[PDB]
Design a protein around this ligand. Structure first.
Ligand SMILES: Nc1ncnc2c1ncn2[C@@H]1O[C@H](COP(=O)(O)OP(=O)(O)CP(=O)(O)O)[C@@H](O)[C@H]1O
Ligand SMILES: Nc1ncnc2c1ncn2[C@@H]1O[C@H](COP(=O)(O)OP(=O)(O)CP(=O)(O)O)[C@@H](O)[C@H]1O
Lengths: 276, 273
């Protein structure tokens, strides 16, 4: 009955709602032994909240990986990874480990309807991460990028994107719709290569949702590590994060985090599952 | 009302049992909003477990502090701070903040210490701002100038001296270092000495015990416990984590930070001495 060891490869969100902070918090909430290999530190200007991303040098990244690999993770999550070099190493680290689960959160920086800073990072994710992924967890924008379809606007568009992403090698795909899709219920689309499942909760408040995405992928990872099937794990993750969102709060004018502990301390949220 | 915002100023322990990892995990267990300003990254050799400390640039340290100060912590903990500059900055961020609680874990590196100047810096910059200072038995001897402490009476003398150097509340941990049948710590508020006692648990897998104790103290303060109640509750919390420590490899094993809530509570005896 030893704690499962869960590693995230991610950066530091100094505001502590997303990034590796959300990951370690979530892993802790879900009774796993959380670990991080840090890639970068993100800080925010006191006056304007402008973000500054400081990459960490590859040598300290590699030293962290050595320690983490030695410990031996049971599951690995990737968060926002800054370079193709790190994207490639993240996949290699998973294959070198005895970890049984790989959750890829394919985080991208969005510049427009259909635009990212460097599409090479998307290509690298496709090449190096998707074919190793137990679960890939794009948001609606990211799913359009990974599938090459551009803007997705419907469940039907999500089904098409999920097919394409699955076919790039991810064993399981969850495309999150959420606020980006509809304002009345929060829809995500899960696909296992055989059946498309719509996942639903109510739409909750949209003001304070910082860290929702990271938390979702973190929870998926921990639930896999603790023995839930991929389908079970993403359902449970959606519930976990829905409670966190419902219980989000205002930290300052710029950030309102999800309450990562809300599932366990406040309330559970039921997820409706329907074949579509 | 809202979750209390608790900041730790500490390095990353890649093995994830101590350092900022223990802090954030403990803060989360105790229903606070944990934050970190990272000072350094510590890694371990896969074959010997020898530590390698990589400092973070001061400018990234400073930019993290600016973000955290803007958010406005309710409580701040200091973990192992490697330089006089960082020690001084830590005290300054607390005084600039509207935080009501400052918990100083006066971590020293045994050689005698590496960096005796850092002991002097902690005394100058941190002790007079500390709500609670949490030296282990070695550190208490260093802070007090008494040298090696080996009894509750020695701890009483050290706590008096440390209080007189400006710390509002002092908890000197005895624990396995004091090496008695039970695990004793000593709390002092300038008026009364309280001995805190638990069972002495296995000693092999105790990595992160010190960090976890200070982190728990900080979260308990932030959530409304008095300093005395906070250190009693922290000892119970860490005692369960220690009881439930586990083997990571042939060189280390961490405490189970979640044990108090997931597994069991541990009783703390409180007596005036
Ligand atoms: N306001 C809201 N109400 C209910 N569910 C929501 C919601 N906003 C998002 N969701 C759900 O939260 C999960 C995460 O969705 P998404 O990937 O869009 O997170 P995010 O980008 O808003 C946060 P971050 O980037 O700060 O870590 C999905 O399950 C989605 O359906
Ligand atoms: N094996 C054990 N059984 C019970 N209590 C213990 C213990 N080891 C430490 N403690 C307690 O754990 C807390 C932290 O103690 P302390 O800071 O002395 O850590 P430590 O024993 O790790 C010294 P170091 O950091 O040098 O390894 C204190 O409350 C102390 O009493």
């Amino acid at each position: 009955g030893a704690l499962k060891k869960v590693l995230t490869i991610a950066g530091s969100d100094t505001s502590a709602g997303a990034g590796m902070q959300a990951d370690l918090k979530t892993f802790q909430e879900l009774d796993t032994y959380g670990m991080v290999a840090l890639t970068a530190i993100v800080t925010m200007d006191k006056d304007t909240w402008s973000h500054d991303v400081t990459p960490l040098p590859m040598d300290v990244f590699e030293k962290q990986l050595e320690t983490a690999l030695s410990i031996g993770p049971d599951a690995i999550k990737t968060g926002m990874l800054g370079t193709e070099e790190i994207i490639k190493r993240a996949g290699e680290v998973y294959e070198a480990s005895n970890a049984q689960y790989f959750v890829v959160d394919p985080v991208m920086v969005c510049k427009g309807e259909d635009e990212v800073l460097n599409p090479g990072n998307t290509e690298a994710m496709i090449k190096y991460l998707l074919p190793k992924a137990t679960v890939v967890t794009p948001n609606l924008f990211e799913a359009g990028q990974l599938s090459g379809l551009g803007k997705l606007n419907s469940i039907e568009d999500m089904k098409k994107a999920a097919t394409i992403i699955f076919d790039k090698g991810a064993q399981h795909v969850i495309i999150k719709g959420g606020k980006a899709l509809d304002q009345d219920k929060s829809y995500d689309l899960y696909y296992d290569g055989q059946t498309f499942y719509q996942l639903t909760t109510d739409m909750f408040q949209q003001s304070y949702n910082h860290g929702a995405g990271c938390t979702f992928a973190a929870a998926t990872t921990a639930y896999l590590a603790n023995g839930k099937s991929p389908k079970e794990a993403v359902i449970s993750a959606k519930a976990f994060v829905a409670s966190a969102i419902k219980n989000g709060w205002k930290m300052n004018d710029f950030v309102g985090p999800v309450d990562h502990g809300a599932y366990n301390r406040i309330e559970h949220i039921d997820v409706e599952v329907t074949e579509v």
